[PDB]
Design a protein around this nucleic acid. Structure first.
Ligand SMILES: [Mg+2]
Ligand SMILES: [Mg+2]
Ligand SMILES: [Mg+2]
Ligand SMILES: [Mg+2]
Ligand SMILES: [Mg+2]
Ligand SMILES: [Mg+2]
Ligand SMILES: [Mg+2]
Ligand SMILES: [Mg+2]
Ligand SMILES: [Mg+2]
Lengths: 169, 159, 68, 292
RNA sequence: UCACCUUGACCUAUUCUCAAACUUUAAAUAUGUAAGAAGUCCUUGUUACUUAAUUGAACGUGGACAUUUGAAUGAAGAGC
RNA sequence: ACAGAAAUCUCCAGUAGAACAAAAGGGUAAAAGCCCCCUUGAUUUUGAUUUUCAGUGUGAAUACAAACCAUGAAAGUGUG
RNA sequence: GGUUGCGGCCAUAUCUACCAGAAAGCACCGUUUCCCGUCCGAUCAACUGUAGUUAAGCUGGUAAGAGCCUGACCGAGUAGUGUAGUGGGUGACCAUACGCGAAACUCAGGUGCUGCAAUCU
């Protein structure tokens, strides 16, 4: 259509929600450090319920956000784990997608003190060129209806390059 | 017991005038107040400093002192059987000019102007205002306007 | 049936034969000229009316016997 | 979705230039509101806005009917001062900041007094009042919606007009050269940025990294072979030309405003009247419900 | 059933009835101020305040205007 | 993925339907709220003012002025 | 007339859907050594207008659009209310006399105006 109307990655985000904090979640940070190459950021707890065992403001999770050429070399490290098979779900109506895998971690060896498993939540945010207008400070606009990302235009993009197939098992 | 605080019974008075909440528009801060100007006191609830007491909302007075963001306004307050001079330190965003005094001062410029061509000729130009005088003679025509109305209507319930 | 219901009430009550059509706010002939015309269509308990206002597509979606 | 009728009726819109994301009215009030015993004294501010491919710089006081521009400068008139490229770098901000100072002072007649800092060193210097002369033209910095960051170009004209002879009150800690470790400006580093040092060193390390990016970037510079070191004399050739003639040459106007209008009055759509909007709805009944 | 006369709420358009401690609106009565000589206009004098700047500010000199001098009615003397 | 109705992550809608120590009312959306940085103006000195009012006192508050600081690029703001 | 910067009044400017924009400006957009900031050059900072584009922003039009704005002898001189009577009525309340006078509804019309600067086949 337009050379500025082509679906792009914005950001891949890598989530692990540990049910506790302490010695365990430092290792959950280090596994998500080496996948990204970036130092990762922790997330606290929004509240406490006395039924899930997590207490408010105790840093019970990690995530990291990767953008650009580095981010497109992390997707396929979890896509062959997922066997290139996404479902009728996994897709937002806004045009993004993600999935949840476990234990790819044989690839990317550090010293590897193998005590534990860290499953991890893939999610990627799609955009198009011109997404600056919502995040820039001055004249903070809104993306129009035509140029906004849709659920179809990303499942028409996933069945494009990265060559997968959808809804099946 | 009974409550007689400063902002007591000010529930609707200091309210913010539907769909005109938010910031104070900048013409309020660009208005110029000189000593002797006659100003209407209307408290803006969104500014809590320099805010007049509830007695002075809607009162009109004369600027006597000018400080950085505030005018000093003199109000006459009836206390018992006499009036006492009240001196109020109000910031200029509770204050607007009285539009009557702009209407007066143009009439002063008008009466000066109308008396000028009273000095060219024809003295005593009759420049005082007069009330609504009684109407004069008329002759009401009927061409195309013949007088017609019928009678009072009967009683119907029309539910 | 309403004359017997007066006795259960204090005060004084009247039996006014209304000139409206049923539980509506328009008279019997005014409701008729709205009825051969297409500004009248059924609801659950009441009747919806057509206006010269709003989108023409919604004036077509509901009320399609009109514009004939 | 579903912005209902009760939602729209109760919505209070932001002003227009809060709805345009173009004005902070929180900052505007504090910049503009004059001391009331300084009755009609206009409080002047230095507007420094940075767009893509331009620097816009103005001297503005405020009236009730709207703002008033005393003196304006642009970086797109730097071509006649000898700056044909680098019009949104840090140093054209100094160049526009220097020009708007010297354009204002000759406009107000105070140009011979208050020459400012003549030879530029990047010493943190403030315009001092001449004793038994007029006070210098007090103007405050409006950075607008841009962020106060150490080394930003919005503080480029802050050094540009302070040395240009305008009394702009400031600290120095947003110039290139401040340290969070030692609370002290680095005047040697700041001396580079005014004369385009931070642009000039990038050429000399792109001389030694790759000619690929040195052919994409500075592609204009390759075409007219300005030396990688010759920037400091380009800017001095303009910093002298500004103080020689800041007088605001206008431009040609080139098919003037009466025929500019009719040139841009043939691509603007016409709002209709009732007689055709009724005709369109009268058409739309036969179009939508003409029994197929 | 292992997509069904015997679905609850929820959403959309309707409908009847209301509010001292609800409200977009909004009276009547009551209420503040103004309707000038302590005024207006012109000239420009002072200052340590204020202005980039006698610029403003405030108070003035000198000059211009006299009772239709700046609505109505009254005033019984006014002020202390 | 575990993970469900509620763990974290991501987008869309969100005029405030939240929050602002404590009741209720008022006020607030590039903030008065949330996060971060710096600080002690919750300072000194004397008058003026507002409310309760006898125009006494007490308490609370508003605007200044001389300082001295904080703060910020700055305009500013701060006498809890 | 367009556009940009700074605005004034702050929806006639807002919101929803669809369609156009010549030039110019604006924007998206290219890169990360430096100043600077981040989990991450998306924000922010810095750089060249260089690789490209009007796709978005943005402006404008369309809509028996929602909303908003104005007017009406539209409701309606209505509801309410001031004043008066040794008026009515058992009372509740009501009628009259001299005045003041809405709102909701309903139709009609509209959909930013303007200031300072600068530039634009
Ligand atoms: Mg109380
Ligand atoms: Mg700011
Ligand atoms: Mg009551
Ligand atoms: Mg009353
Ligand atoms: Mg609290
Ligand atoms: Mg409360
Ligand atoms: Mg007390
Ligand atoms: Mg970038
Ligand atoms: Mg009597």
């Amino acid at each position: 259509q337009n050379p500025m109307r082509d679906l792009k990655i914005e950001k891949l985000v890598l989530n692990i929600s540990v049910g506790e904090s302490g010695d365990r979640l430092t290792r959950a940070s280090k596994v998500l450090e080496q996948l990204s190459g970036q130092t990762p950021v922790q997330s606290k707890a929004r509240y406490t319920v006395r039924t899930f065992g997590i207490r408010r403001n105790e840093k019970i999770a990690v995530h990291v956000t990767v953008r650009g050429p580095k981010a497109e070399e992390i997707l396929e490290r979890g896509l062959k784990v997922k066997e290139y098979q996404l479902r009728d779900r996994n897709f937002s109506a806004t045009g993004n997608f993600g999935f949840g895998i476990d234990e790819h971690i044989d690839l990317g060896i550090k010293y590897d003190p193998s005590i534990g498993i860290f499953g991890m939540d893939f999610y990627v945010v799609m955009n198009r060129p011109g997404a600056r207008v919502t995040r820039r400070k001055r004249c903070k606009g809104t993306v129009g209806n035509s140029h906004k990302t849709t659920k179809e235009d990303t499942v028409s993009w996933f069945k494009q390059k990265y060559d997968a197939d959808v809804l099946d098992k | 017991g009974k409550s007689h605080g400063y902002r007591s019974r000010t529930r609707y008075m200091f309210q913010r005038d539907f769909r005109k909440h938010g910031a104070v528009h900048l013409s309020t801060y660009l208005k110029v107040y000189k000593v002797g100007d006659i100003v209407d006191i209307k408290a803006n609830g969104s500014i809590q400093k320099g805010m007049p007491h509830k007695f002075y909302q809607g009162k009109t007075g004369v600027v006597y002192n000018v400080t950085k963001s505030s005018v000093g306004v003199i109000i006459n307050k009836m206390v018992g059987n006499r009036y006492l001079e009240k001196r109020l330190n109000l910031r200029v965003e509770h204050i607007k000019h009285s539009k009557c005094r702009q209407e007066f001062l143009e009439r002063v410029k008008a009466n000066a102007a109308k008396r000028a061509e009273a000095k060219a000729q024809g003295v005593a130009v009759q420049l005082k205002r007069q009330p609504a005088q009684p109407r004069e003679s008329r002759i009401v025509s009927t061409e195309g306007n013949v007088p017609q109305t019928l009678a009072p209507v009967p009683y119907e319930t029309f539910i | 049936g309403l004359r017997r219901a007066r006795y259960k009430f204090p005060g004084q009550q009247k039996i006014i034969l209304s000139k409206k059509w049923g539980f509506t706010n328009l008279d019997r002939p005014e409701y008729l000229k709205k009825r051969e015309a297409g500004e009248v269509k059924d609801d659950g308990a009441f009747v919806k009316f057509l206006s010269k206002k709003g989108s023409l597509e919604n004036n077509i979606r509901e009320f399609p016997e009109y514009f004939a | 979705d579903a912005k209902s009728s009760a939602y729209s009726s109760r919505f209070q819109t932001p002003f227009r230039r809060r709805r345009e994301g173009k004005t902070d009215y929180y900052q505007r009030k504090r910049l503009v509101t004059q001391h009331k015993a300084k009755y009609n004294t206009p409080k002047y501010r230095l507007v420094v806005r940075f767009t893509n491919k331009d620097i816009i710089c103005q001297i503005i006081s405020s009236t009730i009917t709207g703002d008033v521009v005393l003196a304006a400068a642009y970086s797109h008139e730097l071509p006649r001062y000898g700056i044909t490229h680098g019009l949104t770098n840090w140093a054209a901000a100094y160049a526009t900041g220097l020009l708007i100072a010297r354009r204002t002072l000759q406009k107000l007649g105070l140009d011979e007094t208050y020459k400012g800092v003549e030879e530029v060193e990047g010493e943190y210097e403030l315009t001092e009042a001449v004793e038994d002369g007029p006070r210098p033209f007090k103007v405050f910095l409006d950075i607008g919606l841009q962020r106060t960051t150490t080394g930003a170009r919005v503080f480029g004209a802050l050094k540009g007009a302070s040395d240009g002879g305008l009394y702009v009150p400031h600290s120095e800690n947003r110039f290139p050269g401040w340290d969070f470790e030692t609370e002290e400006i680095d005047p040697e580093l700041l001396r580079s940025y005014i004369f385009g040092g931070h642009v000039s060193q990038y050429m000399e390390e792109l001389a030694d990294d790759d000619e690929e990016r040195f052919s994409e970037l500075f592609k204009g510079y390759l075409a007219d072979d300005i030396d990688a070191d010759s920037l400091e004399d380009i800017y001095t050739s303009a910093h002298e030309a500004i103080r020689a003639d800041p007088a605001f040459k206008p431009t040609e106007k080139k098919f003037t405003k009466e025929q500019y209008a009719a040139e841009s009055k043939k691509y603007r759509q016409t709002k209709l009247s009732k007689e055709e909007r009724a005709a369109r709805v009268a058409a739309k009944i036969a179009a939508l419900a003409g029994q197929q």
